[PDB]
Amino acid sequence: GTVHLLCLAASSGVPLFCRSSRGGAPARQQLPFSVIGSLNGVHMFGQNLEVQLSSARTENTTVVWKSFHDSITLIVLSSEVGISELRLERLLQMVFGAMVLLVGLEELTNIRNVERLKKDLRASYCLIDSFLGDSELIGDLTQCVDCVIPPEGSLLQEALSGFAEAAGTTFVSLVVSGRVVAATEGWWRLGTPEAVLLPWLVGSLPPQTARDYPVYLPHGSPTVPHRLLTLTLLPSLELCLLCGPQLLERWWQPLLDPLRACLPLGPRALPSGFPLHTDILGLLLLHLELKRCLFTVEPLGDKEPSPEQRRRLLRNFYTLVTSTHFPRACYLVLGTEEPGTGVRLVALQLGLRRLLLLLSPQSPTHGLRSLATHTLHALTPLL
């Protein structure tokens, strides 16, 4: 699972940093300048000849280049078992969106000098190696917000609206462990990369009672330095407030009990004790019109241990589902030929609400589509 992210200045050729997360853990591995220079050189050779070198796959690993705008390029090496091109391309787009979120289009295009650019980006690795390493959310890969449905209570939205009116901002979001619990319509209408970047950014940030950080919106305000205030009233619970201790006690005091119900709701997404087929060991749903993602891994944790394995299977299956799909469904049964072994993965698109499922091998192959339709009908009233 060795992975290397290299950020290069296309106009000059000097790399910006060598962030890498070999083996999932944030290993501080420095990739030798041989390969960095060689990959940069092949990229400029292609650019000069009007041929964009996208990716090159080997049997062990996979390497990918791309050029954002005109002066910035990102390349990845990745030896993870089960890699496809689209995962790497989404990773590239998300890292670039994160960059323009943290440093903006200025100092990223039309670089006055790259040394101060690297010194400024020094304050930006943390989210990057959160991205590259093992992550509990797939919002990077699907480009959809990893929303978690609140406990069927409009009181959360009402309190958020009251907080927004008190603070004079339309961008306010209750987020637990990087999962968007609630947000105003303005936050929902936010641009595609930063809508998933901001909750992830806060999840990757160290836990502090209050934090003030400047960001730039890749959609709407690529240059305007919007300030983001993060307040962690409860462990693993956080409130984001964007602007272009008497701060929350006049609205969130009566809602302390539901927020308590949201402390374990983060890792255990979906409403607690939701009626679902017991054979499902991991659920993942998309709403493409609203770009809303729901990714839960622990509906039944006693069997098929190592939930990170379930996350990786669901991510790979989503990659293949996007490969084939882009009243349709597709399933993949993996494992040994021996009955009762392996897993099942199902995917169904219905009403632009593509939904994925991970199941124990005992599930009926004939009824896989029937079960997917049942799950879709059970999940459509949720959102």
Partner: protein, 168 residues
């Protein structure tokens, strides 16, 4: 680490044995078999200059005309350059002027210096061009194993002076 990451771009003729002197300087990373297909070779050698662990991104360029326009892509953004030539070879002796004008027209005016490695030419003429084009000649040999790390240290010191100058 906060490496300065100064980028060398080295220009010669391809038949002067510059690859030999550069390999003698920096071990490990070579990437020697790329000058014939792309036109540039990428090497690195971190060096301790004035309390700074300066990283040296060397970009050797192909002297053949087959890779010239593509070579122009690798000059831009290079923090310093080095023009190599040989006392035995004749073509590089007049090609240094062309290489200097190309390298300054591509990226801009850079604090660089040239180097003669390893006769058909006279030292007085080399001093003549050196004084003509503002840089100082260096006497280098493939066997002496000296007068090169001083070149790189001096160029790194020039760039460090530039950075400490405009940082304030």
């Amino acid at each position: 680490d906060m490496e300065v990451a100064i980028k060398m771009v080295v220009v010669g003729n391809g038949a002067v044995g510059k690859s030999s002197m550069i390999q003698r300087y920096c071990k490990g990373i070579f990437t020697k078999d790329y000058k014939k297909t792309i036109g540039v070779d990428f090497l690195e050698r971190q060096i301790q200059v004035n309390d700074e662990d300066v990283r040296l991104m060397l970009w050797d360029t192909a002297g053949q005309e087959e890779f010239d326009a593509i070579t122009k892509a690798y000059y831009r953004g290079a923090q310093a350059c080095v023009l190599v030539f040989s006392t035995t070879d004749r073509e590089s002796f007049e090609a240094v002027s062309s290489w200097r004008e190309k390298v300054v027209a591509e990226v801009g005016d850079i604090p660089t210096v040239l180097v003669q490695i390893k006769s058909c030419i006279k030292n007085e003429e080399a001093e003549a061009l050196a004084k003509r084009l503002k840089l100082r000649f260096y006497r280098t040999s493939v066997k002496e194993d000296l007068n090169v790390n001083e070149v790189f240290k001096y160029l790194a010191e020039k760039y460090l002076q530039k950075l400490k100058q405009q940082i304030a």
